[PDB]
Design a protein around this nucleic acid. Structure first.
Lengths: 119, 297, 146, 108, 67, 83
RNA sequence: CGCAAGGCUGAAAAAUUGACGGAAGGGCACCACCAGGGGUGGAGCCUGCGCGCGCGCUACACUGACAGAGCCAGCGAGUACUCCCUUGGCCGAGAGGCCCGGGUAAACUCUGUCGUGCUGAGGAAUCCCUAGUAAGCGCAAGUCAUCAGCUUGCGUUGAUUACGUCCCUGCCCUUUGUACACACCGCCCGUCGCUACUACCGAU
């Protein structure tokens, strides 16, 4: 902000900062620097954490149950199992968080949907 | 992959709604910047908003960049505008006729980078699935009445708009003999658009000119020998496809090489071909009182 | 006219015209339902001679009546009696005097005379969710029917 | 205004009925009955469009804890001929132990 | 329509989208990759470049190298 | 061949598009038609003005191919309706 | 309101950067070759386009007819849907309502009975087509444009032959650029323009 408004490096680093924060999912728009004024927030980081983002994705029911499930280790993010309940899930890894391989929670979901393939 | 398409479409719709609210605020912020430079007194409801001034000090620069045109608007085409060659497949309805298949070939040859696909027994969600699975930019569906085509459906992918249009006055390439016609040249075509002035007209201009691969801008004003013309009167966009030689610096000889349409659009939906429940952006309002008087595009 | 087959929008309308020549003259005309549904005459129908296809605004019912409001010109008659009273003159009578003299009743249509309409209260069917959609939608919004 | 109109200005216009040669088809739907029909159809289509959005944007790995105390909608193959997409609910009955049925049958 | 085409071709203005360079942002001059007061404002710009190097390293390391 | 290539070849044959001749070549041309051929070129290379079949005649009889002009016929019919 | 709003007049260039080619070498193409398949074109019906033309539809027999047995789908639910018009009679002062007459598949599999019998699969051309593709089959819908003389979905059964090459027909492009190591190549060719200078020719 304190740079002059027609500055090239100001414009380039505004677009870089907004694109970085929108790719990490903290901001919901990438067209205002007042988003980084009063919308970037430790609560925005803490809701980009893993048990809250799988509460939102409805992998669990509540953030307490989600922290219990990812402490017991049913949740992988991508291809690697995640035991840390503070792993910050970015906007393009929210498409890859899912259950682990031999999960009893996955067997519970398939047994509910009556698609329990035992092979 | 499918979760990524759904997530990116939802993020796009949320960003568009936030842009609506931010435009409602930024119409007020552009009065504060113009009053600061010119010294004309402004409204008290604008000059006495502390949040507006406090955030204006950070958000000057994007308004200046939009005034200079240095940035581009959040759009489904602005992500890959002149970077990727848009690949596009043309398909028929389910059981095509021979003249519909030859017409599908003709409007495949209209685009230099298109491919044609045989429908046969191909369910339409799996058609959309295979398009997103092979990263196609556009699909175009064709519908015939009885050996004569009556509808196009131009759908942009991954989640872009459909333009459904009905065709009239179709004169096929496959009616004239091979002694008079020939193999159409496949060079990157120039495009001209005539008569689009509303923002809806610029919308249909965008979703029609992002079907063609981008022209090399070094010497494009004189090189290239093939032109495609979209000109609308009474919101029925009429399209010709010519090939030309510049027989002098003052004169040019045209030669009609492709099919002639006068397509009329009747539906522009912000959502792909599978979504029948997508939110429409415009539709041809028949059976209203002044829907025949009012001209869009 | 009267609807014959009723699809979602396009309805076939029967007792209005007599031939495809008359329909081809009245092609594109603004047809209307009694209820208020607008529509347009689209195409003459081949196999029953005198029917046509008209695409309406929403779905019309078989009880509905489909009208087309044309404007036919009426020319006045060129009659002129002078009222030469001191000589004598023939006075043309009125329609009531003509009917009472030559004994013909006034034309009265029972379909035209106003009646009281017994409207039952319109109750509609409940929502009928399809099986595949009702099996595909998620757990928080799954339908629970004993 | 309202005082610049006669009683014949105020007089109501009557509604025509269905013709008597066509009264078996039901009532003649006018603007009011058509408005009721259109309201009911737009409401049902709004609910169905929201259900189609919810069935499209469904996480395939979701896990609620009612799934361990409910029977799912299944498929036509797993359920059978008696397959509706509705999750079956409980009528309140329960399998009853032998001592309590001994008590009930002594009473009967 | 034919005369409109001839006018555009002669006084050639075409509405085709043009091929832009994919690195117009970071490399605006388009250099070739082979053989080759105001001091207050320059000091402020270099301070913002230093701050952004530190902050981009922290944000990529906090998103755990998915960026 | 292509329509572009055959258009260029016919205009090179008619001498409308060829290389810039010198004054000596113009002397040879003034030492030693083309509108009548340009009319045929502008009719042949714009084949959509008139309606043609592609197959040709079904049964060949030898005895001594534009079959209709829809644009001119529609304009003529609209003038009749105007009158 | 002021300017615009006064007719040497009477319809049909730029270039030190330009104009057009040729030869060599590449890339691609069911508008190319190669191997096959399928339409249309023969008879009848009809939308449409301008008597003609195709696009669909139907009939044309070994892939047969008759009688049985068994066994398979998917999309589809607006108090909403109905094919006519009539001979009579009922109850109808009259308008009507009644009654009786006249005009969830196809396919497939198995088992038997009879046996080519006006009871004949489309010429020259021309076009299209490479995997759940060609082709057969039915079921459903009728979504503000188009479409009932049909349209669009949806399932079912599911092959032959290419999947190489630029030889033919063409299309695009290199011979300037756009990156640097290894490694390789080694001044493509023609007809004119334009500019600068030099001298020539002959009238004023």
């Amino acid at each position: 902000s304190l740079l002059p408004p027609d500055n090239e490096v100001r414009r380039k680093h505004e677009t870089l900062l907004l694109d970085k924060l929108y790719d990490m999912g903290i901001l919901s728009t990438k067209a205002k620097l007042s988003a980084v004024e009063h919308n970037v927030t430790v609560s925005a980081f803490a809701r980009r954490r893993l048990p809250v983002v799988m509460t939102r994705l409805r992998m669990a029911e509540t953030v307490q149950a989600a922290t219990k499930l990812i402490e017991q280790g049913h949740v992988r993010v991508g291809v690697e199992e995640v035991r840390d309940p503070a792993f910050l899930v970015t906007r393009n890894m929210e498409d890859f968080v899912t259950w682990t391989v031999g999960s009893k929670i996955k067997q519970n979901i398939m047994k509910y949907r009556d698609k329990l393939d035992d092979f | 992959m499918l979760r990524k398409q759904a997530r990116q479409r939802r993020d796009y719709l949320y960003r568009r709604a936030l842009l609506l609210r931010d435009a409602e605020i930024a119409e007020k912020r552009a009065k504060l910047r113009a009053a600061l430079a010119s010294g004309k007194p402004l409204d008290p409801k604008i000059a006495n908003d502390k949040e507006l001034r406090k955030d204006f000090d950070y958000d000057v620069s994007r308004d200046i960049a939009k005034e200079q045109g240095e940035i581009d608007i959040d759009d489904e085409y602005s992500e890959l505008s002149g970077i990727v060659d848009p690949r596009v497949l043309v398909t028929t309805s389910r059981d095509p006729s021979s003249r519909l298949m030859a017409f599908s070939k003709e409007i495949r040859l209209m685009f230099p980078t298109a491919i044609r696909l045989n429908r046969g027994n191909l369910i339409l969600p799996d058609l959309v699935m295979s398009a997103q699975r092979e990263r196609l930019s556009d699909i175009i569906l064709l519908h015939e009445h009885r050996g004569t085509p009556t509808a196009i459906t131009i759908s942009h992918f991954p989640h872009g708009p459909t333009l459904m249009a009905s065709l009239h006055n179709v004169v096929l390439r496959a009616d004239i003999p091979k002694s008079i016609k020939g193999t159409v040249s496949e060079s990157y075509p120039h495009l001209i658009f005539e008569g689009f002035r509303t923002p809806l007209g610029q919308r249909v201009v965008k979703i029609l000119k992002h079907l063609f691969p981008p022209r090399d801008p070094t010497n494009n004003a004189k090189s290239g020998n093939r032109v495609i013309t979209f000109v609308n009167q009474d919101d029925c966009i009429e399209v010709r496809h010519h090939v030309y030689v510049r027989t002098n610096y003052n004169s040019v000889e045209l030669s009609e090489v492709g099919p002639r349409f006068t397509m009329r659009p009747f539906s522009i939906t912000m959502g792909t071909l599978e979504n029948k429940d997508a939110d429409v952006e415009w539709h041809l309002s028949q059976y209203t009182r002044t829907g025949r008087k009012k001209n869009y595009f | 006219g009267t609807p014959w087959k009723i699809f979602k929008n396009t309805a076939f309308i029967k007792d209005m015209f007599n031939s495809s020549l008359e329909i081809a003259k009245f092609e594109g005309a603004a047809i209307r339902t009694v209820s208020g549904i607008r529509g347009q005459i689209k195409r003459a129908l081949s196999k029953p001679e005198g029917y046509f296809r008209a695409t309406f605004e929403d779905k019309i019912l078989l009880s509905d009546i489909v009208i087309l409001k044309a404007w036919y010109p009426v020319k006045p008659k060129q009659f002129y009696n002078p009222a030469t009273n001191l000589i004598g003159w023939q006075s043309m009578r009125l329609t009531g005097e003509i009917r009472r003299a030559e004994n013909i009743p006034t034309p009265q249509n029972p379909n035209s005379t106003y009646r009281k309409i017994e409207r039952p209260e319109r109750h509609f069917n409940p929502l009928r969710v399809p099986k595949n959609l009702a099996a595909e939608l998620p757990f928080k919004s799954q339908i629970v029917q004993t | 205004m309202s005082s610049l109109r006669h009683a014949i200005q105020r007089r109501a216009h009557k509604e025509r009925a269905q013709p008597l040669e066509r009264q078996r088809l039901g009532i003649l739907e006018k603007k009011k009955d058509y408005r009721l029909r259109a309201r009911d159809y737009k409401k049902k289509q709004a609910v169905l469009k929201s259900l189609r959005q919810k069935a499209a944007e469904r996480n395939e790995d979701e896990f609620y804890f009612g799934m361990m105390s409910r029977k799912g909608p299944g498929s036509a193959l797993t359920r059978g001929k008696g397959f509706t997409g509705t999750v079956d609910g409980d009528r309140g009955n329960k399998a009853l132990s032998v001592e309590t049925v001994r008590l009930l049958k002594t009473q009967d | 329509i034919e005369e409109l085409i001839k006018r555009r071709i002669l006084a050639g203005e075409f509405d085709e989208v043009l091929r832009r360079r994919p690195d117009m942002f970071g490399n605006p001059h388009g250099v070739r990759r082979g053989l080759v007061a105001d001091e207050k404002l320059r000091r402020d710009e270099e301070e913002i470049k230093r701050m952004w190097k530190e902050i981009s390293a922290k944000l990529d390391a906090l998103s755990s190298w998915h960026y | 061949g292509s329509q572009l290539k055959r258009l260029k070849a016919s205009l090179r044959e008619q001498g409308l598009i060829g290389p810039q001749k010198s004054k000596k070549q113009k002397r040879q041309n003034a030492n030693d038609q083309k509108a009548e051929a340009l009319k045929s070129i502008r009719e042949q290379f714009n084949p959509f003005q008139f309606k043609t079949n592609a197959r040709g005649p079904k049964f060949e009889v030898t005895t001594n191919v534009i079959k209709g002009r829809p644009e001119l016929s529609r304009a003529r019919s609209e003038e009749k309706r105007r009158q």
